[PDB]
Amino acid sequence: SSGLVPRSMKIVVPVMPQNIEEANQLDLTRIDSTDIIEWRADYLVKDDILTVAPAIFEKFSGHEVIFTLRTEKEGGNISLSNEDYLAIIRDIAALYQPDYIDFEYFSYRDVLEEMYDFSNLILSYHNFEETPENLMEVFSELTALAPRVVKIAVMPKNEQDVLDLMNYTRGFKTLNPNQEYVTMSMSKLGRISRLAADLIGSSWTFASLQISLADMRKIKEVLDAN
Fold this sequence. Notes:
- By secondary structure, the chain is an alpha/beta fold.
- The chain has one domain: TIM Barrel (Alpha-Beta Barrel), CATH 3.20.20.70.
- 37% of the residues lie in helices and 19% in strands.
- The protein has 9 helices and 8 strands.
- It has an 8-stranded parallel β-sheet.
- Helix 6 links the parallel strand 6 and strand 7.
- The chain is globular, with a radius of gyration of 17 Å.
- It starts with 9 loop residues before the first strand and ends with a helix.
- InterPro entries: Aldolase_TIM, DHquinase_I, Type-I_3-dehydroquinase.
- Keywords: Amino-acid biosynthesis, Aromatic amino acid biosynthesis, Lyase, Schiff base.
């Protein structure tokens, strides 16, 4: 439960401080209490993650937090060995107990077994080049592991790719109503998939502090109105 250091679609807001000073300068003025904060810790060098963590978790006390190490293989800014990846995740978990922990499935599938005692994992996959032919199989594979969240983000090359991501999400949510999915078709081309979180069965949508938190809240209002 508590860590060694005390204290309708939802919007996830990523934060990417590159040092402790930036972390302490993060502006909470635009964030509301229901927003989930995603700490993109991969924006830091390995040796700075633990040093910045206390500031992140003090700053965002009272918010749900996702701890994310996005690797270079999937559009992230860090590379880590299996050992270092697991060590950092385990120490953050023990120290701060983030509400969710990102686990980059295909990058670290081998050692997923060592996370058997975690029940707050987001099993995530990101393809920045295309929307794979076997997308359905990806949904199936991650679902079978029954993580806290199945997260799939893909890059469309045409309009049908976007619709396919949307359709697979609702299809799998219908098959698996108790499984939380967070999905998106990336790029301007895929934007509708982000606005359509409720329709498609994605529990969260990612908004920036490509669509802003400001606009996302407005469009939520449009969609929710009588």
